[PDB]
């Protein structure tokens, strides 16, 4: 059903969406110990799940003040969407998984080290991504089906996952958030174009769907560094991602909350994991 469109716009799920969903993933609370001690995360399994096939997989942080267990809570219910649109045909059936930043060392800033070492083995020695095997070599070779992104002080998260993970991670869904790295833009931008060098990676290999509300403080620290990146040669600018790997979508009235933030998911979680899929699908 999913067709790339060029510039895709902000449109909420319909209201039904945040309602239970009759064919419900199910939600499982994991604990596991790593570099900054014992915590916990979610994960959302699609419904239907089966371990003899290999899925696409999400991991989505929380904002400031948060925790692994904000985003399915009632507060956001982000489960409701993916279930309906996963019924729907409008989202392909993939993991999602919750983690943290809070706990012993951990920060937002310095999350992407435990995401690495501890939490991608985790969740992918468990359940079935494209992962063969959760080595760094396994990982790295499945990154293509990989995709992290986070909301605020998560993502601040993402962009920090980016800059350190390119060689695990293909796309990026920052919501509400900008990269710290930087007394500039450009100095932001140029940070990102080292990292893309430095991974050896074209252009056709990693994918940013930005997102913001055009009401969400945000906005004013995401959009001058969305503007300097847009000017690297290392993003061509649109969401048809079949021809291009950068987009920003600005929803219209949106403030910095959940409510909104929950249905940038919505639009732009569709758009992930195509490109050089396993699948053979005509997007
Ligand atoms: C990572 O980028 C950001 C995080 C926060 C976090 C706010 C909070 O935790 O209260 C606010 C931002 O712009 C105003 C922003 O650009």
């Known amino acids: 059903s999913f067709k790339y469109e060029s510039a895709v716009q902000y449109r909420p799920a319909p209201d039904s969406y945040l309602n239970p969903c009759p064919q419900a993933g199910r939600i499982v609370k994991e604990t596991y110990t790593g570099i900054n001690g014992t915590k916990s995360l979610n994960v959302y399994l699609p419904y239907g799940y089966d371990p003899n096939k290999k ?3 999400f991991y989505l942080m929380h904002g400031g003040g948060e925790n ?12 409701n969407i993916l279930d309906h649109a996963i019924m729907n045909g409008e989202l392909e059936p993939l993991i999602v998984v919750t983690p943290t ?40 070779a499945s990154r293509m089906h990989r995709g992290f992104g986070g909301f605020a002080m998560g993502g601040l998260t993402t962009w920090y996952v980016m800059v350190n993970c390119l060689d695990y991670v293909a796309y990026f869904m920052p919501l509400s958030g900008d990269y ?3 007394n500039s ?17 074209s252009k056709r290999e990693y994918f940013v769907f930005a997102a913001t509300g055009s009401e969400d403080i945000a906005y004013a620290n995401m959009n001058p560094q969305i503007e300097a990146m847009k ?15 950068f987009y920003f979508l600005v929803a219209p009235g949106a403030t910095h909350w959940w409510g909104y933030v929950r249905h940038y998911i919505y639009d732009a979680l569709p758009y992930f994991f195509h490109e050089l899929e396993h699948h053979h699908h005509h997007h």
């Open 55 to 57: 899925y696409n997989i």
């Open 68 to 79: 692994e267990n904000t985003i399915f809570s009632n507060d956001v219910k982000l489960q």
């Open 101 to 140: 930043f809070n706990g012993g060392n951990c920060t937002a800033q310095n999350f992407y080290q435990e995401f690495r070492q501890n939490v991608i083995p985790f969740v992918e020695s468990k359940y079935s991504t494209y992962a063969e095997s959760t080595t760094p070599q396994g990982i790295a």
């Open 180 to 182: 710290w790295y930087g």
């Open 185 to 201: 833009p450009q100095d932001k931008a140029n940070s990102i174009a080292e990292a893309i060098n430095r991974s050896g990676l």
């Open 231 to 245: 000017a690297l040669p290392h993003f061509d600018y649109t969401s048809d991602f079949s021809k291009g790997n």
